[PDB]
Curated annotation (Swiss-Prot), chain A:
Present with 35100 molecules/cell in log phase SD medium. Early fractionation of eukaryotic MCM proteins yielded a variety of dimeric, trimeric and tetrameric complexes with unclear biological significance. The MCM2-7 hexamer is the proposed physiological active complex. This is DNA replication licensing factor MCM3. Component of the MCM2-7 complex. The complex forms a toroidal hexameric ring with the proposed subunit order MCM2-MCM6-MCM4-MCM7-MCM3-MCM5; loaded onto DNA, forms a head-head double hexamer. Interacts with CSM1. Acts as a component of the MCM2-7 complex (MCM complex) which is the putative replicative helicase essential for 'once per cell cycle' DNA replication initiation and elongation in eukaryotic cells. The active ATPase sites in the MCM2-7 ring are formed through the interaction surfaces of two neighboring subunits such that a critical structure of a conserved arginine finger motif is provided in trans relative to the ATP-binding site of the Walker A box of the adjacent subunit. The six ATPase active sites, however, are likely to contribute differentially to the complex helicase activity. It comes from the Eukaryota. Signal peptide: none annotated. It is found in: Nucleus. The gene is MCM3. The lineage of its organism: Eukaryota, Fungi, Dikarya, Ascomycota, Saccharomycotina.
UniProtKB/Swiss-Prot annotation, chain B:
Component of the MCM2-7 complex. The complex forms a toroidal hexameric ring with the proposed subunit order MCM2-MCM6-MCM4-MCM7-MCM3-MCM5; loaded onto DNA, forms a head-head double hexamer. Interacts with CSM1 and MCM10. Acts as a component of the MCM2-7 complex (MCM complex) which is the putative replicative helicase essential for 'once per cell cycle' DNA replication initiation and elongation in eukaryotic cells. Core component of CDC45-MCM-GINS (CMG) helicase, the molecular machine that unwinds template DNA during replication, and around which the replisome is built. It is found in: Cytoplasm; Nucleus. It comes from Saccharomyces cerevisiae (strain ATCC 204508 / S288c). This is DNA replication licensing factor MCM7. It comes from the Eukaryota. The gene is MCM7. Present with 166 molecules/cell in log phase SD medium.
Curated annotation (Swiss-Prot), chains C, D:
It comes from Saccharomyces cerevisiae (strain ATCC 204508 / S288c) (Baker's yeast). The gene is MCM5. This is Minichromosome maintenance protein 5. Belongs to the MCM family. Acts as a component of the MCM2-7 complex (MCM complex) which is the putative replicative helicase essential for 'once per cell cycle' DNA replication initiation and elongation in eukaryotic cells. The active ATPase sites in the MCM2-7 ring are formed through the interaction surfaces of two neighboring subunits such that a critical structure of a conserved arginine finger motif is provided in trans relative to the ATP-binding site of the Walker A box of the adjacent subunit. Present with 10300 molecules/cell in log phase SD medium.
Length: 195, 47, 46, 46
């Protein structure tokens, strides 16, 4: 987060640091379905925003339908609509790689749908994603709004930290682990190898 | 149009008759719910 | 129902804002970072 | 090339009209029965 500058915007990057805060997982409305009792018909609509497509589009600000093309009143069908989850997290440079006595640097990561609940505050993490500039930096009237749209989130383990360490076991590894057992001095061999 | 329509595997007029039949038929193993309703009439039940 | 004058006209501004009707409608009216939904000077098609 | 002020801004009107550049461009700028192409108050996206 300290060596990430304005010359790396619009490129895929890997960032190291510590997770300092996570927000509440909220639903996001995509498609909404309705019912008209005067015609027995169901209607739908779609919604989109700027944080779902990597390229810039022309905005379409559609509205929430309460009324039919003739004027019939519509009932909202909450069970038939589609919702997708959302979360935001903040990353900061790890305390044992940061310069002593100096204030730290941080970066915002946006996660959606399946990557929404993978970490907790106070974790070592590695994130990969696109470093995006958003909106207009006051030219319609500080600078531009910058954030990472996450695609990969890796938990990492370090000494004196709440993330556990696990390894993938190969069948070859299993064979040695199981072979060692039969010999009746397992305790001594494992004990003498402890520091 | 600007409001498109979709087709779903449901029908409300069909299930309303089923609601009515249940409320004017159910005798648990006079009719149960229609006795609840007769107590409702005389101001002796609130839910 | 008054055709004798020779008058009604089309609305000049979008009526969605003055009819803050639904609870999600006034929420769809916002967004796009920090700005106010502006439909335009005369946006009604027959 | 002047970042010292703390300024350029986005154009407020569409530049297609003032740059009457092509012979078919000033013709695409008309139509829709009788009216003048009006893009809007501030129509530029980055």
């Amino acid at each position: 987060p300290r060596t990430l500058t304005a010359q790396h915007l619009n490129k895929l990057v890997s960032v190291e640091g510590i997770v300092t805060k996570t927000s509440l997982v909220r639903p996001k409305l995509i498609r909404s379905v309705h019912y008209a009792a005067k015609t027995g018909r169901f209607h739908y609509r779609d919604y989109t925003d700027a944080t779902t497509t990597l390229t810039t589009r022309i905005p379409t600000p559609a509205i929430y339908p309460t009324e039919d093309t003739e004027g019939n009143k519509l009932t909202t069908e909450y069970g038939y609509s589609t919702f997708i989850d959302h979360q935001r997290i903040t990353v900061q440079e790890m305390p044992e790689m940061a310069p002593a006595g100096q204030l730290p640097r941080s970066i915002d990561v946006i996660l959606d749908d399946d990557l929404v609940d993978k970490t907790k505050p106070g974790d070592r993490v590695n994130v990969v994603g696109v470093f995006k500039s958003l909106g207009a930096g006051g030219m319609n009237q500080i600078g531009f709004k910058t954030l990472i749209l996450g695609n990969t989130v890796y938990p990492l383990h370090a000494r004196s930290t709440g993330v556990a360490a696990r390894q993938m076991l190969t069948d070859f590894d299993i064979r040695n682990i199981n072979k060692l057992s039969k010999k009746k001095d397992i305790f001594d061999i494992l004990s003498q190898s402890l520091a | 149009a600007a409001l498109p329509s979709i087709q779903l595997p449901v029908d409300y007029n069909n299930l309303f008759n089923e609601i009515t039949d249940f409320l004017v038929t159910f005798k648990q193993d006079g009719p149960k719910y229609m006795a609840m309703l007769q107590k409702v009439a005389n101001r002796e039940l609130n839910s | 129902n008054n055709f004798n004058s020779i008058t009604v006209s089309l609305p000049r501004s979008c009526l969605s804002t003055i009819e803050s009707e639904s609870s999600m409608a006034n929420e769809s009216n916002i967004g796009d970072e920090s700005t106010k939904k502006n439909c335009g000077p005369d946006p009604y098609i027959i």
